């Protein structure tokens, strides 16, 4: 079964892209120092409502989730893959 | 500065692709249940020597590292990106 | 080897969505009578330049191509598929 | 009125799924070389009886029909669409 766990603590790059099917899309940024990196976090369930409700750009946050990489072939007929951090169950989100 | 941390516990899909510059390349697989997923782990430094030395396909392992996504444009002149889990400093590898 | 051939004669629904990588995207409409249907035509190669150059919404056209259905999993983690008519080699496009 | 025509020559993937309301369901496969593709052919009317009668898996066939894409919303309340090749009138089926 193994374990797939990702922990990230960083600030948003832009206000949440919540879209009620709900599902929020956020791009967390986690530096060093700075090879500042960016992260594509997908907050499923209710946890999304909250993001919209009071998260909002600049906001520092804590996230626990799992790694999800989905492959999606494009027009030119080529296979491309996107890697993201999903917050379904288990994971969590926490304003700081 | 934020935090970028990834924890994974799974089994290899194929023996290590170590290449002394060293650097080992391993594809960890971490299921659920099973949407079994696969992971592209890059073990830098000395930690690579060990992988080659005694890791080897099927081997169950523990890994702590950071998320690295590098973009690389191709012949057709298009921008593609690859997401991996690097084991430089901080991270670790542990036979189980 | 079999044969996969599609012939369509209809009018565009909206001016071409050419995007130089080139590749044009057009939605041909082919009625009866009227269960008017719509088609997602993808004009690869040079044939795209022309589309942009002088095709343009309302324009009646002739197209010969092949059937291409690509599957692409989404955020909710579900597999979805899109069916289109590609104009690579063989196929053709012809202003009428 | 436009024209919507599809011509395919390939072999079945599995014996016909005829269901007398009749209507047969067949998944034709048409390669290149091989990006082997598969097709969802729906043989309406009498043409279905024949399919059941003597078509049967592996059988190479010729088909002329029209493109039909129907949209059907699912439990999660999302809109999904399925694209198929219908053999009502006009089209034809021919053992080879």
């Amino acid at each position: 079964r193994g374990v797939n766990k990702v922990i990230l603590v960083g600030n948003l790059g832009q206000d949440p892209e919540v879209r009620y099917m709900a599902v929020a899309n956020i791009t967390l940024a986690t530096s060093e120092s700075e090879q500042t990196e960016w992260h594509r976090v997908v907050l499923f369930g209710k946890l999304a409502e909250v993001a919209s409700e009071y998260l909002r750009k600049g906001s520092q946050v804590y996230i626990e989730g799992q790694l999800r990489t989905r492959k999606w072939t494009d027009q030119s007929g080529q296979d491309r893959y996107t890697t993201e951090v999903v917050v379904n169950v288990g994971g969590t989100m926490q304003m700081l």
Side-chain angles (χ1 to χ4, degrees), chain A residues 70-81:
Chain A
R70 52 224 239 288
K71 109 151 145 258
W72 104 108
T73 72
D74 65 322
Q75 311 246 90
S76 303
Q78 79 237 86
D79 277 12
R80 304 312 241 15
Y81 310 57

Side-chain angles (χ1 to χ4, degrees), chain A residues 5-25:
Chain A
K5 197 161 223 313
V6 172
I7 303 181
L8 240 73
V9 179
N11 300 238
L12 294 187
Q14 40 139 13
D15 297 312
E17 248 158 70
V18 297
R19 275 144 213 190
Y20 291 35
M21 224 154 224
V23 174
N25 290 272

Side-chain angles (χ1 to χ4, degrees), chain A residues 8 10 21 26 35 39 43 47 56-57 65 81 85 87 93:
Chain A
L8 240 73
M21 224 154 224
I26 67 176
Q35 244 240 172
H39 271 106
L43 289 157
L47 243 344
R56 151 168 344 197
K57 197 222 184 239
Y81 310 57
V85 308
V87 207
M93 211 258 326

